[PDB]
């Protein structure tokens, strides 16, 4: 198109009635597919994070699974490492775990007990904030390792689901908002 | 790739008997956590790919979920987009899916119907090649979209499981090898 924000915005594809009737799904797949829009997305998140924390971040925490598509590349742009927060069962060795609500049921996330040392400053990233279930669980786990969660970020936020309120006092930033 | 490769090898951590007895789990998590290791792994994959295929690659395809950690960064380094291959039920809109065999029973993968156009040339990435079942299924999905799979790559290859044979005649490159 032209601007970087509109380049990202034109590449978020809408799918009505997926996964269930009445929902409007936001697919980030086109953002990844277009190298110019992927780099526009990473650069917007990076510039936000650099301006906001002045270089003083220790790690990005990428959220299983779609957050893994952004976390490493964001971290690398910022010159940082990326740690992983995963669905239960996926990581080897001693873990901490936290439950959250998933569709009609309950699920769990986990982090390795040595993923972070105390006092490390971390930004959580995922593609999309919907109910805020996994993101909230992520914050719980990081606090348990005595990490300082600076904020959570996503490319997209679905405001009608009120996942941002669920994260307070943890600050939250999104690039784009839809219902 | 001596020094750079040692930076990767040093950060692969092994866990006996996970997830089940007699399996040595290879954990790439410390590679992601160290930005120099991550940058070395991405550079070494990119360098091999450019030295082998030059500018003939159109897209990287990342395998759900640990392939997601490397695909976008590899595609960015090459100036290419990245397309996604997911566990069934995760992608919106029209898809093609297939089933393949695992340790007792079946698993299923899928791809969006419009991920690639015919004759487009793709390299598949995952973190580790074991039996090659998953990567083989990804190759088959991509074939059904009339994509040309130039190569599959990973950080680790478990050579006693003969994943390389399963993929033939699609070439396969790994940074590190173990029995
Ligand atoms: N020993 C192992 N360590 C880590 N991941 C493994 C191991 N064996 C299999 N996998 C994973 O299982 C999938 C590969 O299985 P395969 O389809 O048998 O090649 C990939 O996602 C690998 O990352």
Coordinates of C-alpha atoms and ligand atoms in Angstrom, one line a residue:
Chain A
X1 CA 0.0 0.0 0.0
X2 CA 2.4 2.7 1.4
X3 CA 2.8 3.1 5.2
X4 CA 4.1 0.3 7.4
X5 CA 1.0 0.3 9.7
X6 CA -1.3 0.0 6.6
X7 CA 1.0 -2.6 5.1
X8 CA 0.4 -4.7 8.3
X9 CA -3.3 -3.8 8.5
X10 CA -4.0 -4.9 4.9
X11 CA -2.4 -8.3 5.5
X12 CA -4.6 -9.2 8.6
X13 CA -7.1 -11.4 6.8
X14 CA -10.7 -11.7 8.2
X15 CA -12.5 -15.1 8.3
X16 CA -16.1 -15.0 9.4
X17 CA -17.5 -18.0 11.1
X18 CA -14.2 -19.6 12.0
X19 CA -13.8 -21.5 14.2
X20 CA -17.5 -21.3 15.2
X21 CA -20.5 -19.4 13.6
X22 CA -20.6 -15.7 14.5
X23 CA -16.9 -15.2 15.3
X24 CA -14.7 -13.1 12.9
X25 CA -11.2 -14.6 13.0
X26 CA -8.1 -12.5 12.3
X27 CA -5.4 -14.4 10.4
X28 CA -1.9 -13.1 10.5
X29 CA -0.7 -15.6 7.9
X30 CA -0.4 -12.9 5.1
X31 CA 1.8 -10.8 7.3
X32 CA 4.4 -13.7 7.5
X33 CA 4.0 -14.4 3.8
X34 CA 4.8 -10.9 2.6
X35 CA 8.5 -10.2 3.6
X36 CA 7.8 -6.4 3.6
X37 CA 4.9 -6.7 5.9
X38 CA 6.6 -9.1 8.3
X39 CA 9.5 -6.6 8.6
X40 CA 7.0 -3.7 9.0
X41 CA 5.3 -5.7 11.9
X42 CA 8.6 -6.5 13.7
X43 CA 9.8 -3.0 13.2
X44 CA 6.7 -1.4 14.7
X45 CA 6.8 -3.7 17.8
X46 CA 10.5 -3.1 18.1
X47 CA 10.3 0.6 17.8
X48 CA 7.5 0.7 20.4
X49 CA 9.7 -1.5 22.8
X50 CA 12.9 0.4 22.2
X51 CA 11.2 3.8 22.8
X52 CA 9.3 2.6 25.8
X53 CA 12.1 0.7 27.7
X54 CA 15.2 2.4 26.2
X55 CA 17.0 -0.8 25.5
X56 CA 16.5 -2.2 29.0
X57 CA 14.8 -5.5 28.3
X58 CA 16.5 -8.8 29.2
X59 CA 14.3 -11.3 27.3
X60 CA 11.3 -11.6 25.0
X61 CA 8.9 -14.5 26.1
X62 CA 7.2 -16.1 23.1
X63 CA 3.8 -17.7 23.6
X64 CA 3.0 -21.1 22.2
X65 CA 2.2 -21.4 19.2
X66 CA 1.6 -18.3 17.0
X67 CA 3.7 -16.1 19.4
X68 CA 6.6 -18.2 18.3
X69 CA 6.4 -16.7 14.8
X70 CA 7.0 -13.2 16.3
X71 CA 9.1 -13.6 19.5
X72 CA 12.4 -14.8 18.1
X73 CA 12.4 -12.3 15.2
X74 CA 11.4 -9.5 17.7
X75 CA 14.1 -10.5 20.1
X76 CA 16.7 -10.7 17.4
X77 CA 15.8 -7.2 16.1
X78 CA 16.2 -5.9 19.7
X79 CA 19.5 -7.9 20.2
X80 CA 17.8 -10.1 23.0
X81 CA 17.2 -13.7 23.8
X82 CA 13.8 -15.4 23.6
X83 CA 12.4 -17.7 26.2
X84 CA 9.4 -20.0 25.6
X85 CA 6.1 -20.4 27.4
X86 CA 4.5 -23.6 26.2
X87 CA 1.4 -25.8 26.4
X88 CA 1.8 -28.4 29.1
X89 CA 3.8 -31.5 28.2
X90 CA 6.0 -29.8 25.5
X91 CA 9.1 -28.8 27.5
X92 CA 11.7 -31.2 29.0
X93 CA 13.0 -30.9 32.6
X94 CA 11.6 -29.3 35.7
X95 CA 8.7 -26.9 35.0
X96 CA 6.3 -24.6 36.7
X97 CA 2.7 -24.7 35.3
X98 CA -0.5 -22.6 35.4
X99 CA -4.1 -23.4 34.3
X100 CA -6.3 -21.1 32.1
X101 CA -9.6 -21.4 30.2
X102 CA -9.5 -22.9 26.7
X103 CA -12.8 -22.9 24.7
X104 CA -15.3 -25.1 26.7
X105 CA -12.6 -26.5 28.9
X106 CA -9.4 -26.0 30.9
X107 CA -5.7 -26.2 29.8
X108 CA -2.2 -25.5 31.2
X109 CA 0.9 -23.7 30.2
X110 CA 4.4 -24.3 31.5
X111 CA 7.9 -22.8 31.7
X112 CA 11.2 -24.4 32.6
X113 CA 12.3 -23.6 36.1
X114 CA 15.6 -22.3 34.8
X115 CA 14.2 -20.3 31.9
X116 CA 15.0 -17.0 33.8
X117 CA 17.0 -15.8 36.9
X118 CA 15.4 -13.5 39.4
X119 CA 15.0 -9.9 38.4
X120 CA 15.2 -10.3 34.7
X121 CA 12.9 -8.0 32.7
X122 CA 10.7 -9.6 30.2
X123 CA 8.1 -8.7 27.5
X124 CA 5.6 -11.3 26.5
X125 CA 4.6 -11.5 22.9
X126 CA 1.8 -13.3 21.1
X127 CA 0.1 -12.7 17.7
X128 CA -3.3 -11.9 19.1
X129 CA -5.0 -11.0 22.4
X130 CA -8.5 -12.5 22.6
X131 CA -9.8 -13.8 26.1
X132 CA -6.3 -13.1 27.4
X133 CA -6.1 -16.6 28.9
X134 CA -2.7 -17.8 27.8
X135 CA -1.2 -14.3 28.3
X136 CA -2.4 -14.1 31.9
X137 CA -1.1 -17.6 32.6
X138 CA 2.2 -16.5 31.1
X139 CA 2.5 -13.5 33.4
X140 CA 1.7 -15.8 36.4
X141 CA 4.6 -18.1 35.5
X142 CA 7.1 -15.3 35.0
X143 CA 6.2 -13.7 38.3
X144 CA 6.9 -17.1 40.0
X145 CA 10.5 -16.9 38.6
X146 CA 10.7 -13.4 40.0
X147 CA 10.9 -11.9 36.6
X148 CA 9.8 -8.3 36.0
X149 CA 7.1 -8.4 33.3
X150 CA 7.4 -5.0 31.6
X151 CA 4.4 -5.5 29.4
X152 CA 2.6 -7.9 27.1
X153 CA 2.4 -7.1 23.4
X154 CA 0.3 -8.5 20.4
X155 CA -0.1 -7.5 16.8
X156 CA -3.9 -7.7 17.2
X157 CA -6.3 -7.2 20.0
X158 CA -10.0 -8.2 20.1
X159 CA -11.4 -5.6 22.4
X160 CA -14.9 -7.0 22.9
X161 CA -13.4 -10.0 24.7
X162 CA -11.8 -7.7 27.4
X163 CA -8.5 -9.6 27.7
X164 CA -6.6 -6.4 28.5
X165 CA -8.6 -5.9 31.8
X166 CA -7.6 -9.4 32.7
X167 CA -3.8 -8.5 32.5
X168 CA -3.9 -5.3 34.7
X169 CA -1.7 -4.3 36.5
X170 CA 0.5 -5.6 33.6
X171 CA 0.6 -3.0 30.8
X172 CA -0.5 -4.1 27.4
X173 CA 0.1 -2.9 23.9
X174 CA -1.5 -3.8 20.6
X175 CA -0.7 -2.6 17.0
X176 CA -4.3 -3.1 15.7
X177 CA -7.7 -3.4 17.4
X178 CA -10.9 -5.1 16.2
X179 CA -14.0 -6.3 18.1
Chain B
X1 CA 31.1 -24.1 10.5
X2 CA 33.5 -24.2 13.5
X3 CA 33.0 -21.2 15.9
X4 CA 29.5 -20.3 14.8
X5 CA 28.4 -24.0 14.8
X6 CA 30.0 -24.6 18.3
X7 CA 27.8 -21.6 19.5
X8 CA 24.8 -23.7 18.4
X9 CA 26.0 -27.1 19.6
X10 CA 26.9 -25.8 23.0
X11 CA 23.3 -24.7 23.5
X12 CA 21.6 -28.0 22.6
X13 CA 20.7 -29.6 25.9
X14 CA 19.8 -33.3 26.2
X15 CA 17.3 -34.9 28.5
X16 CA 17.2 -38.8 28.8
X17 CA 13.9 -40.6 28.9
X18 CA 11.7 -37.7 27.9
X19 CA 8.9 -37.8 26.9
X20 CA 9.1 -41.5 27.3
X21 CA 11.8 -44.0 28.4
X22 CA 14.7 -44.5 26.0
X23 CA 14.2 -41.2 24.1
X24 CA 17.0 -38.6 24.5
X25 CA 15.2 -35.3 24.1
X26 CA 17.1 -32.6 22.3
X27 CA 16.1 -29.2 23.6
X28 CA 16.8 -26.2 21.3
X29 CA 15.5 -23.8 24.0
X30 CA 18.9 -22.5 25.0
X31 CA 19.7 -21.6 21.4
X32 CA 16.7 -19.3 21.3
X33 CA 17.6 -17.8 24.7
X34 CA 21.2 -16.9 23.6
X35 CA 20.8 -14.2 20.8
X36 CA 24.3 -15.1 19.5
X37 CA 23.5 -18.8 19.3
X38 CA 20.1 -17.9 17.6
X39 CA 21.8 -15.6 15.1
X40 CA 24.5 -18.3 14.4
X41 CA 21.9 -21.0 13.8
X42 CA 19.9 -18.7 11.4
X43 CA 23.1 -17.6 9.6
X44 CA 24.4 -21.1 9.1
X45 CA 21.0 -22.3 7.7
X46 CA 20.8 -19.2 5.4
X47 CA 24.4 -19.5 4.2
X48 CA 23.9 -23.2 3.3
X49 CA 20.6 -22.4 1.5
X50 CA 22.2 -19.5 -0.5
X51 CA 25.3 -21.6 -1.4
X52 CA 23.0 -24.4 -2.6
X53 CA 19.9 -22.8 -4.2
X54 CA 21.1 -19.2 -4.8
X55 CA 18.0 -17.0 -5.4
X56 CA 15.7 -19.8 -6.6
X57 CA 13.9 -20.1 -3.3
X58 CA 10.4 -18.4 -3.2
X59 CA 9.2 -19.3 0.3
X60 CA 10.2 -20.8 3.7
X61 CA 7.6 -23.1 5.3
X62 CA 7.6 -23.4 9.0
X63 CA 6.4 -26.5 10.8
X64 CA 4.0 -26.1 13.7
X65 CA 5.2 -25.4 16.4
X66 CA 9.0 -25.6 17.0
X67 CA 9.6 -24.8 13.2
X68 CA 7.7 -21.5 13.8
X69 CA 10.7 -20.4 16.0
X70 CA 13.1 -20.6 13.0
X71 CA 11.0 -20.2 9.8
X72 CA 10.2 -16.4 10.0
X73 CA 13.8 -15.5 11.0
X74 CA 15.3 -17.7 8.2
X75 CA 12.9 -16.3 5.6
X76 CA 13.6 -12.6 6.8
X77 CA 17.4 -13.3 6.5
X78 CA 16.7 -14.6 2.9
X79 CA 14.3 -11.7 2.0
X80 CA 11.5 -14.2 1.6
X81 CA 8.1 -14.8 3.1
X82 CA 7.3 -17.7 5.3
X83 CA 4.2 -19.9 5.0
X84 CA 2.7 -22.1 7.7
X85 CA 2.0 -25.8 8.0
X86 CA -0.1 -26.6 11.1
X87 CA -1.7 -29.3 13.1
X88 CA -5.2 -29.8 11.7
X89 CA -8.0 -27.5 12.9
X90 CA -5.7 -24.5 13.6
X91 CA -5.9 -22.6 10.2
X92 CA -8.9 -20.7 9.0
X93 CA -10.6 -21.0 5.7
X94 CA -10.2 -23.6 3.0
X95 CA -7.4 -26.1 3.7
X96 CA -5.9 -29.4 2.5
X97 CA -5.1 -31.9 5.3
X98 CA -3.5 -35.4 5.6
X99 CA -2.9 -38.0 8.3
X100 CA 0.4 -39.7 9.0
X101 CA 1.6 -42.3 11.5
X102 CA 3.2 -41.7 14.9
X103 CA 4.1 -43.9 18.0
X104 CA 0.7 -45.7 18.1
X105 CA -2.2 -44.2 16.1
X106 CA -2.3 -41.1 13.8
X107 CA -1.5 -37.4 13.6
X108 CA -2.9 -34.8 11.1
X109 CA -1.4 -31.7 9.4
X110 CA -2.9 -29.0 7.1
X111 CA -2.1 -26.1 4.9
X112 CA -4.2 -23.1 3.6
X113 CA -5.5 -23.7 0.1
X114 CA -3.9 -20.5 -1.1
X115 CA -0.5 -20.7 0.8
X116 CA 1.4 -21.2 -2.5
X117 CA 0.8 -21.1 -6.2
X118 CA 1.9 -23.8 -8.6
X119 CA 5.6 -24.0 -9.4
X120 CA 6.5 -21.9 -6.4
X121 CA 9.7 -23.2 -4.7
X122 CA 9.8 -23.8 -1.0
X123 CA 12.3 -24.9 1.7
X124 CA 10.7 -26.5 4.8
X125 CA 12.1 -25.9 8.3
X126 CA 11.6 -27.7 11.6
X127 CA 13.9 -27.8 14.7
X128 CA 14.7 -31.6 14.5
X129 CA 14.3 -34.5 12.0
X130 CA 13.5 -37.9 13.6
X131 CA 11.6 -40.5 11.6
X132 CA 10.8 -37.8 9.0
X133 CA 7.0 -38.5 9.3
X134 CA 6.1 -34.9 10.0
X135 CA 8.5 -33.3 7.4
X136 CA 7.4 -35.9 4.8
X137 CA 3.7 -35.1 5.4
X138 CA 4.5 -31.3 5.0
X139 CA 6.2 -32.2 1.7
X140 CA 3.2 -34.1 0.6
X141 CA 0.9 -31.1 1.5
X142 CA 3.1 -28.8 -0.5
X143 CA 3.1 -31.2 -3.5
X144 CA -0.7 -31.1 -3.5
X145 CA -0.4 -27.3 -4.0
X146 CA 1.9 -28.1 -6.9
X147 CA 4.8 -26.4 -5.0
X148 CA 8.4 -27.6 -5.7
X149 CA 10.1 -28.6 -2.4
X150 CA 13.7 -27.7 -3.0
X151 CA 15.0 -28.9 0.5
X152 CA 14.1 -29.5 4.1
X153 CA 16.3 -28.2 6.8
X154 CA 16.7 -28.6 10.6
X155 CA 19.1 -27.8 13.5
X156 CA 19.2 -31.5 14.6
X157 CA 19.0 -34.8 12.8
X158 CA 18.7 -38.2 14.6
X159 CA 20.4 -40.4 12.0
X160 CA 19.4 -43.8 13.3
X161 CA 15.8 -43.0 12.6
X162 CA 16.5 -42.6 8.8
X163 CA 14.3 -39.5 8.3
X164 CA 16.6 -38.6 5.3
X165 CA 15.5 -41.7 3.4
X166 CA 11.8 -41.0 3.9
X167 CA 12.2 -37.5 2.4
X168 CA 14.2 -38.7 -0.7
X169 CA 14.4 -37.5 -3.3
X170 CA 13.9 -34.2 -1.4
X171 CA 17.3 -33.2 -0.1
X172 CA 17.8 -32.6 3.6
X173 CA 20.3 -30.5 5.6
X174 CA 20.9 -30.5 9.3
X175 CA 23.4 -28.4 11.4
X176 CA 24.1 -31.2 13.9
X177 CA 23.7 -35.0 13.9
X178 CA 23.3 -37.6 16.6
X179 CA 22.4 -41.3 16.4
Ligands
LIG1 N1 14.6 -36.8 20.5 C1 13.8 -35.7 20.2 N2 14.0 -34.5 20.7 C2 13.3 -33.4 20.4 N3 12.3 -33.5 19.5 C3 11.9 -34.6 18.9 C4 12.7 -35.8 19.2 N4 12.2 -36.9 18.5 C5 11.2 -36.3 17.8 N5 11.0 -35.0 18.0 C6 10.1 -34.1 17.4 O1 9.0 -34.8 16.8 C7 8.9 -34.3 15.4 C8 9.8 -35.1 14.5 O2 9.2 -36.4 14.5 P1 9.4 -37.2 13.2 O3 8.1 -36.9 12.5 O4 9.5 -38.6 13.7 O5 10.6 -36.6 12.4 C9 9.6 -33.0 15.4 O6 8.7 -32.0 15.7 C10 10.7 -33.1 16.4 O7 11.0 -31.8 16.8

